[PDB]
Amino acid sequence: EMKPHPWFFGKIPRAKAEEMLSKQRHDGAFLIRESESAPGDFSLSVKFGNDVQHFKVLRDGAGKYFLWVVKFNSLNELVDYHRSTSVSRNQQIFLRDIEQV
Numbered sequence: 848e849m850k851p852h853p854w855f856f857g858k859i860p861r862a863k864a865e866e867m868l869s870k871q872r873h874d875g876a877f878l879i880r881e882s883e884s885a886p887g888d889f890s891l892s893v894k895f896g897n898d899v900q901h902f903k904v905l906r907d908g909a910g911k912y913f914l915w916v917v918k919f920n921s922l923n924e925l926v927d928y929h930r931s932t933s934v935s936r937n938q939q940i941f942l943r944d945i946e947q948v
């Protein structure tokens with residue numbers, strides 16, 4: 848019973864993603880947005896404690912997506928990968944869906 852993903856927020860400003868995620872209770876709560884500072888690139892924003900961390904979604908020459916090293920044919924696969932491998936090199940932070948209304 849296929850539903851849209853609760854993590855894609857399109858073109859919300861960086862600050863608005865911070866505003867929204869700061870109200871989430873659980874570390875790893877996250878969203879993918881379309882960067883305003885680098886149009887055509889995506890960004891990943893993630894709740895951690897009293898902070899919101901931002902990551903560039905990077906592309907290889909073939910248009911595969913990655914944060915650090917492991918890359919995927921889709922944002923959806925990148926997201927899913929990072930539900931169980933940390934997005935961060937300084938903390939263990941695993942992507943989890945927002946609590947949505």
Ligand SMILES: [Cl-]
Binds near residue numbers: 932933
């Ligand atoms: Cl890990």
